[PDB]
Each structure stands twice: as C-alpha cells, then as structure tokens.
C-alpha cells in the first residue's frame, strides 16, 4: 500500500489512475494569513477548491497530487474537508519552498534536523493528524542555489533515501536551477526517476528540457494556463515537439493551478488570442484536444497521465 491519501486508506501505486501531478487546492503565505486574517475567506477558498476538484473528476481525474508545503500554506485539515466533499484521491506532501534563506527557526540547525521534519510527516503524519506525506517538495528560483536552498535539497535526499517517497521540485526555467537540483539530488544517491523537475514548461529551450529528461528525471510541463511564463500555444508546441521526439515517458503535464492564491494580481497583458481560462481542467479543453488533432494518440495520453505517475510513485 504505497501511496498515502488524505482522509483515506493508502493505495497501491498501480491504482493511482489518471493523475494531475502538480495542483494546489489553496496557497497562501503562513505569516501573512496569521497576522492579517481579514485578507482571507476560507469559505470562498473551500467552495472554489471543491468546484475545481469536482470538474476535474468529471473529466476522469482519479488522483490529484498537491505540492503545497511550508511557505505556501499547507493545511491538511482543509485538504481533508475537500476530500470529504468530493471523494478525490489526494496526495499531500512535505517540504519547504524558499528562494533565498530559511525562516529564523532554522538558525544553527543541521540538514539532518530539516530532514527529520520531512520524515516526521512521511512516517508519523502531517500537522498532528494521521494523514501522511507521499512526496517531498523543494524549490529554487531566480537567486539560484543558495546555501539554505542547498540545505533543503540535501534534506530532501535524506528523506527519499529513508522513505523512498519521490521528490517534486519548483525551478526557474530560465536559469539552470532544475539541472542543479537534479545533479545535487543524484549525487546524494537519489534515483533520477524519483525526481520531477518542475516548471520546465515555462521555457521553449527544448535542448535544456531534453537534457534533464535524458539524465533520467521527469520533466514538469506543468504551469499550463499561465501565459506569463509561456503562452499555452508555445507550451503546446514544446509539448508536441517533445512527444514527437520520443519523450512521452518523461513528460508530466499539469496546470499548477491554485484554486485560490493570495499573491497580488499582476499587470494584465492582452494578446491577439483571447486568454484561455487558467483552471484545473484547461488541459482537457485546450492541451489534450490540441494534442489529439495534431496526431498524438490515446496511448501517449495514458503514458503521461497514468503510467508516468505510477512509475514516479512506484
């Protein structure tokens, strides 16, 4: 019974079914929400999350993997309520999202101490519940591999070696952070096939993407719907090029959709094409249809959304 699920008994990885590997039921900054609760509306967040999950299930999604962790407001009790309302298979994780330095708590603390937090969540449970973490999430972005970023990467390696759960990353597609994450993890003894290097869909530098896939890790053509990083069409072109080039067995596709996020809204940009609705089902309305009529068959779709997650969690 490999994979722990929020609010359910654990399931064998072979039964994961059609999976969205990188979605967020909700995201927020823990410190801002604790200090200024007036900014938030949990009931609206809950309604939005339930609606999106139901829509995903209507398109045949069986399992959602939610890599919300420390820094983005992971709340296992909110997740379990969404499960109760929908019946979705939901995989929660553990980890830390930082781009520069760790919080003040971590002053004078070792990599082992950080790893112990992840292992606690995997083996004992999350936030005082018996819901266990099924993967580790880590990050790097524009600042690159800082001292503290490297500490978290190495802690994730320790957690993987002890518990065998896979690792999902956040990277910046325009620097080499994804490649660096992969290298540091594999040097620490992590199987490359247990790593998903995230946010690679943000670039059309296909050689960089192929380099990571060729080293053995899954490539996250996630953020489907955020044209800020790269338009859906260019993403689609990149996705289609990778498929016709033979990389289906390394491709993971998701939206990285946040049913509710607290980030300020950026300046809008309007293109000659009307922006597709970023949602947890955009790949069913745009990407998958775009793919199909470009010649890619059902077996490729099954590889990306079923076989690849199965392997990842196997």
Residue 202 interacting with Fe ion (CB under 5 A): no
Taking the C-alpha atoms of residue 290 and residue 257, their distance in angstroms, rounded to an integer, is: 19
Stretch that binds Co ion, among 71-79, 100-108, 162-170, 281-289 (CB under 5 A): 162-170
Pair 158, 129: CB distance under 8 Å:
no
With a CB cutoff of 8 Å and minimum separation 6, the contacts of 90 are: 5, 6, 7, 25, 63, 64, 66, 79, 82, 83
Q: What's the distance, Cα to Cα, between the start and end of the chain in Å?
A: 10
To the nearest whole angstrom, how small is the minimum distance from the Cβ of residue 283 to its own copies?
A: 25
Q: Which of 74, 137, 154, 170 binds Co ion (CB under 5 A)?
A: 170
Q: Which of 109, 164, 273, 277 binds its own copies (CB under 8 A)?
A: 109
120 is in an annotated binding site: no
The closest alpha carbon to 22, from 310, 229, 185, 255, belongs to 255
Please state the φ and ψ torsions of residue 28, each to the nearest 5 degrees: -165, 165
Residue 241 touches which of Fe ion, its own copies, Co ion, none (Cβ within 5-8 Å per kind): none
Q: Provide the mask over 71-90, with x wherever binding to its own copies is found by CB under 8 A and - wherever it is not.
A: xxxxx---------------
Residue 31 interacting with its own copies (CB under 8 A): yes
Q: Which of 10, 14, 77, 103 binds its own copies (CB under 8 A)?
A: 103
To the nearest whole angstrom, how small is the minimum distance from the Cβ of residue 184 to its own copies?
A: 23
Q: Which of residues 50-79 bind Co ion (CB under 5 A)?
A: none
Please state the φ and ψ torsions of residue 76, each to the nearest 5 degrees: -65, -30
Bridge-based pairing of strands 3-5 and 8-11 is antiparallel
Pair 198, 226: CB distance under 8 Å:
no
Q: Which residues bind Co ion (CB under 5 A)?
A: 170
Using CB under 8 A, list all residues that contact its own copies.
28-32, 34-38, 69-75, 99-101, 103-109, 113, 117, 120-121, 124, 127-128, 262-267
Chain residues that interact with Fe ion, rule: CB under 5 A: 256
């Amino acid at each position: 019974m490999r994979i722990p699920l929020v609010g359910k008994d654990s399931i064998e990885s072979k039964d994961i079914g059609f999976t969205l590997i990188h979605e967020h039921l909700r995201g927020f900054s823990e410190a801002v929400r604790q200090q200024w609760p007036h900014l938030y509306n949990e009931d609206e967040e809950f309604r939005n999350a339930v609606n999106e999950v139901k829509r995903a299930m209507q398109f045949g999604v069986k399992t959602i993997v939610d890599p919300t962790v420390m820094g983005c407001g992971r709340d296992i009790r909110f997740m379990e309520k969404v499960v109760k309302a929908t019946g979705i298979n939901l995989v929660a994780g553990t980890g830390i999202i930082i781009f520069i330095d760790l919080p003040f708590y971590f002053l004078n603390r070792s990599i082992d101490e950080i790893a112990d937090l992840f292992i606690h969540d995997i083996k004992e449970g999350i936030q005082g519940t018996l819901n266990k973490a099924g993967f580790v999430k880590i990050a790097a972005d524009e600042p690159g591999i800082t001292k503290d970023v490297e500490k978290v990467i190495k802690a994730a390696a320790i957690a993987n070696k002890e518990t065998k759960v896979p690792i999902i990353t956040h990277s910046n597609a325009h620097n080499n952070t994804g490649l660096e994450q992969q290298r540091i993890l594999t040097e620490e003894g992590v199987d490359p096939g247990k790593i998903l290097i995230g946010h690679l869909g943000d670039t059309d530098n296909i050689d960089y993407i192929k380099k990571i896939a060729d080293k053995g890790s899954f490539i996250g053509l996630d953020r489907y719907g955020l044209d800020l990083f790269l338009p859906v069409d260019k993403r689609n072109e990149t996705t289609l090029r990778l498929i016709k080039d033979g990389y289906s067995d390394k491709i993971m596709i998701s939206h990285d959709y946040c049913c509710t996020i607290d980030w300020g809204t950026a300046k809008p940009e309007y293109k000659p094409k009307l922006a597709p609705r970023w949602s947890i089902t955009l790949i069913f309305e745009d990407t998958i249809p775009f793919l199909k009529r470009n010649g890619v068959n059902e077996e490729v779709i099954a590889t990306i959304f079923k076989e690849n997650p199965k392997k990842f969690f196997s």
